[PDB]
Amino acid sequence: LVPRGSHMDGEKAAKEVKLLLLGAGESGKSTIVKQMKIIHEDGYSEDECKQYKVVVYSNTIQSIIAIIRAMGRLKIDFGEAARADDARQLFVLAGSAEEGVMTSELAGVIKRLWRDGGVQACFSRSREYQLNDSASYYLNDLDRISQTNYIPTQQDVLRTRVKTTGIVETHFTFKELYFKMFDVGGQRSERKKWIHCFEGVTAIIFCVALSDYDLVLAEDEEMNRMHESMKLFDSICNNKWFTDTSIILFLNKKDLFEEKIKRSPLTICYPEYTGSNTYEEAAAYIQCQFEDLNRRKDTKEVYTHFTCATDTKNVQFVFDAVTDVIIKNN
Amino acid sequence: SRVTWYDFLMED
Numbered sequence: 001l002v003p004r005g006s007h008m009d010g011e012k013a014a015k016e017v018k019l020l021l022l023g024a025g026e027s028g029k030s031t032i033v034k035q036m037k038i039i040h041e042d043g044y045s046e047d048e049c050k051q052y053k054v055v056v057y058s059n060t061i062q063s064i065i066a067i068i069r070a071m072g073r074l075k076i077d078f079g080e081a082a083r084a085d086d087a088r089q090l091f092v093l094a095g096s097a098e099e100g101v102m103t104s105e106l107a108g109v110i111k112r113l114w115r116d117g118g119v120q121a122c123f124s125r126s127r128e129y130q131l132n133d134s135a136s137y138y139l140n141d142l143d144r145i146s147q148t149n150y151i152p153t154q155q156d157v158l159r160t161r162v163k164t165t166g167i168v169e170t171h172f173t174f175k176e177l178y179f180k181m182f183d184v185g186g187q188r189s190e191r192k193k194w195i196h197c198f199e200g201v202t203a204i205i206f207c208v209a210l211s212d213y214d215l216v217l218a219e220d221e222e223m224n225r226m227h228e229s230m231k232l233f234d235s236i237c238n239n240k241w242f243t244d245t246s247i248i249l250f251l252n253k254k255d256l257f258e259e260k261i262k263r264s265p266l267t268i269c270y271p272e273y274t275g276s277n278t279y280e281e282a283a284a285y286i287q288c289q290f291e292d293l294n295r296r297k298d299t300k301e302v303y304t305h306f307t308c309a310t311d312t313k314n315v316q317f318v319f320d321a322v323t324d325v326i327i328k329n330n
Numbered sequence: 331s332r333v334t335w336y337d338f339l340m341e342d
């Protein structure tokens with residue numbers, strides 16, 4: 001009889017990293033959670049992907065409906081009058097794919113609408129109704145996603161937009177560190193829950209949608225999205241809870257920002273900006289706008305990264321650097 | 331009552 005050894009068996013306890021994802025809606029937080037799942041975890045199994053079929057269809061239909069309604073609000077006519085009929089059917093059949101089944105009729109409606117010239121004229125002005133950034137992804141792949149045998153690919157799942165009700169968490173192991181990553185939205189909660197959420201936080205990743213710089217304001221909004229995010233990041237940087245915390249800034253959606261900066265002047269967001277409307281200088285200006293909100297720059301540093309949260313390779317690289325920083329400060 | 335995390339942080 002050989003007495004059994006210790007349960008640990010010579011293994012040390014893993015160091016735990018409490019990481020908080022913060023940022024305004026649509027900044028890329030949940031996309032980063034899903035990227036963590038893809039990179040440092042199992043990925044997504046077919047039983048997991050089949051679950052997102054209904055979500056893919058719902059996001060597609062909601063996006064095309066948002067564009068169609070925007071057309072009515074913006075006084076944009078259809079390129080071909082026939083499309084009106086299609087539009088009507090889209091509202092009749094909007095709930096047809098709740099069973100995960102997109103009928104051929106609905107697919108034809110969406111295809112004929114997405115083809116129209118007026119619908120594309122409205123899509124190009126998407127900034128006037130804050131269209132979500134996954135619309136074109138699904139709509140341009142309509143032929144593929146419409147098939148009956150269709151199962152969402154991993155990139156299809158990254159692009160889904162899901163409503164968050166409770167505690168969105170993911171866990172993984174990276175560089176012998178146990179990461180507890182919590183996605184924190186804008187929901188209202190009890191103060192004790194916030195105290196528990198902000199206690200012992202090792203790192204914060206604050207996500208900022210650069211491409212939100214030119215979006216119109218919704219009614220009763222006191223300021224544009226970029227300035228809302230600047231307000232949030234100010235409160236984050238200069239708070240007592242996070243004096244110990246590593247503050248990381250993900251200037252996300254750089255791929256969309258690069259295409260936008262050509263057509264849309266940064267002055268829409270920052271009227272004082274006198275620089276050029278190029279990717280490099282506008283990006284530097286936004287970076288400095290957020291960084292200068294740090295009112296204790298000597299004692300505390302802000303680690304800034306430009307990211308495309310939907311690009312798994314870029315996210316992997318950036319998170320490797322982020323983890324190096326976390327280790328350095330521990 | 332219930333409050334967003336931003337308003338919670340700024341309460342101080």
Ligand SMILES: Nc1nc2c(ncn2[C@@H]2O[C@H](COP(=O)(O)OP(=O)(O)O)[C@@H](O)[C@H]2O)c(=O)[nH]1
Nearest residue numbers: 025026027028029030031133134159253308309
């Ligand atoms: N082209 C592009 N789209 C992105 C990027 N990051 C997020 N998106 C999309 O923007 C939408 C909102 O992103 P999400 O992670 O859900 O923001 P959240 O509300 O903070 O969770 C989603 O459709 C994402 O797929 C990016 O870096 N580049």
